[PDB]
Structure formats: C-alpha cells, structure tokens
Amino acid sequence: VKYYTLEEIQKHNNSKSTWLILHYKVYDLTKFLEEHPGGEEVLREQAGGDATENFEDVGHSTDARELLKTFIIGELHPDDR
Numbered sequence: 001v002k003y004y005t006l007e008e009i010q011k012h013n014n015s016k017s018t019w020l021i022l023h024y025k026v027y028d029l030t031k032f033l034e035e036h037p038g039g040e041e042v043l044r045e046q047a048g049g050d051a052t053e054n055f056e057d058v059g060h061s062t063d064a065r066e067l068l069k070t071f072i073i074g075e076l077h078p079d080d081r
C-alpha cells in the first residue's frame, strides 16, 4: 500500500493534477477529466477532496467502477480517514 495525507491530496486540485478520494482510495483523474460522461465541472468542484457521497448519489455502473480501478494510485492515510 501507498498512503497519501489529506494535506498532500488537497494540492492536486487543478488541471495540471487532479486527485480524488473515493471510499478511502486515492485516484489520479488528470487524464480522465475530459473523458468523464458526467462532465469536467463535477470532478473539478471535488478535486483534491473526498467525493464518495457524490459518486454513489448519482449512481455508477460496474463499468464506471472498473474504469475507476485504472486510475488508483494509493489510499488515504489512516490518520486522515
């Protein structure tokens, strides 16, 4: 496992680097921003933070969750969970 602090994840909130936390897992979605069927805006608003509630609320297919696995870079540090 690779752990990332909330302090570190929060720096990745822009077009050069966008990270997202979903259910304690950290994803680098920089290359996915323009490819997202739900638009760049919803991802840009949540960039550098936890979006678990937002992701589950709209509903996402198993296909969306399998695609999500390809962007995983680590997990949120246990002290920030």
Ligand code: HEM
Residues within 6 Å of the ligand: 029, 032, 036, 037, 038, 042, 043, 046, 051, 054, 055, 058, 059, 060, 061, 063, 064, 065, 067, 068, 071
């Ligand atoms: C901030 C987090 C996210 C929000 C709020 C969000 C929101 C949405 C919305 C509104 C749609 C439109 C379909 C609908 O009306 O239900 C959608 C579709 C989709 N999203 Fe996201 N999404 C998020 C993150 C992601 C991520 C991280 C991925 C994958 C890497 C992803 C992949 C998709 C795909 C593939 C679809 C097409 C419909 C489906 O397969 O379920 N989304 N998203």
Ligand SMILES: [Cu+2]
Residues within 6 Å of the ligand: 022, 023
């Ligand atoms: Cu989960």
